[model samples]
Target: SGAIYVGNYRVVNRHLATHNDWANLVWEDSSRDLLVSSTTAQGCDTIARCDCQTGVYYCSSRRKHYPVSFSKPSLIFVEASEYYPARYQSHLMLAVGHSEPGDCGGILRCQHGVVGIVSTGGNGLVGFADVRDLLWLDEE
Candidate 1:
């Protein structure tokens, strides 16, 4: 993962789950203008789970966006076994034909809500970790 810079603050990256390829970021600086504005009254309170065979979309680093579908969780084999605890594990699979390196870390969103975060992919499939299963922060 790369560093995320916002305003005068450099977000501290924490809560990394290599097996799931997801991470949590903490921004300590206090800047009202840079704060995220909540539009929905209730806001997004929960993450979706086991929602497969559904349409979803995400934006890549180069401003490229694509519509993809989610399939059932499948075992993905990582070539770099040293970097990961296990070589193969079940992950949320996308039905996309291909993906780019810049696509990694992109948010996978469905009509219901956020499904997962883009991780890795090849061979006509993309893998992601379920957002509901990723680590969560209680507060700042």
Candidate 2:
């Protein structure tokens, strides 16, 4: 019924999961950061990012000292095998996979699946509107 911001929220129940530890986020106050529900905190964190071009939402946490694309620990699969977002170069290529790359560039082993495209400079810059696109980039 309400929303809450991640990270900003303290780690109340740090036992549910690692990527997800904030379980005490308030709704009204979350109007600033990524409005995520207590149930989709980690899931949204994995595929959360902003767009620097059209002020849209996408997945590109790599700019946040994380990785290039959506975070693996935060992906939310639906029914298919599983998917993940990946990048091949410096803001040139991207894709989703069952896992992710480990220092491998241009040698990705993805399933040709794409949740969405992260515009240039997106991610923790264009507010939250440009960060909600991650929701469309998730699936099984």
Candidate 3:
């Protein structure tokens, strides 16, 4: 767990799950809009719908109703690698990308749905823990 100052807000790190190099972190005081978005994958033709906020004062000023429709990711990566052991891992996933040392805790989203948080990255690859596996740790 960690804490950082994002402008005027104090963001706190909340750990959800972990598996070797893969982990999940929920950033407090941050909006869900900051998560990454991806296009529909191949072979998935169906489109789903969900509502989101829009406009300049969408997060603050509650004026007129502003809802933007979006679709969730058709595919979510969930496979363990050599770096991630199968016996100690359950919801580890990988992607072809590079992330910086301080990029951990960043959201890894597939379209409008969250896949996981950035855990580790190197050698042209990014590792993350699946969000579904962290649900048990979520506190209401």
Candidate 4:
């Protein structure tokens, strides 16, 4: 598998999960723009972007937007939690919680836990990589 470049910044990449589920990502950069794009027209039904240095990150679909964020920039891979990424101040902070899936048929159901963010500080630029297609997106 290879990598795809969204402009200059890499839209984040990681190995595909053996389980049938989608990933949750949140960008912490505040210099550039972030996008959670899908290969298919409707591969991803929802997406959200935040511009705070320390706060919560939520996709447009999330009802309860939790407060979350990293002191600097970060790329977080959340487990079975909410549809958004929450952030807190501090250098080394960890957030984990159980979450249930909604009407959407992706991600995981109410499970053990879940987690989101990043570095292309294009004045708060963030992007999300969905694995609905282009298996390469799952390459390590």
Best by lDDT: 1
What tens digits encode model 1's per-residue C-alpha lDDT throughout 13-65? 12222322222223221111011221212332334544555656454654655
TM per candidate? 0.52, 0.19, 0.35, 0.22
- Candidate 3 has a TM-score of 0.35
Score candidate 2 by lDDT: 0.25
| TM-score between model 2 and native | 0.19
**lDDT by residue for model 2 (1-140), tens:** 11223333321111112343334333211111232224433432233343322212222323221223333222222222112233211222222322221111111111222212222122232111123333433432
| Deviation of model 1 at 88, angstroms | 1.1
Q: Rate the local accuracy (lDDT) of all candidates.
A: 0.44, 0.25, 0.32, 0.27
CA deviation > 4 Å runs, candidate 2: 1-7, 10-23, 27-49, 52-77, 80-94, 100-140
Better TM-score candidate (1, 4): 1
Off by over 4 Å in 4: 1-38, 42-51, 58-64, 74-140
Candidate 1 local distance difference test against the native: 0.44
Give the winner by TM-score: 1
Ranking by lDDT: 1, 3, 4, 2
Error of 3 at 52 (Å): 19
Over the stretch 1-140, how does candidate 3's per-residue lDDT look in tens digits? 21222222222222322231122333321221112112122222211122221111011112222222222222333234333322332334555555444455554433444444444455665544434333322232
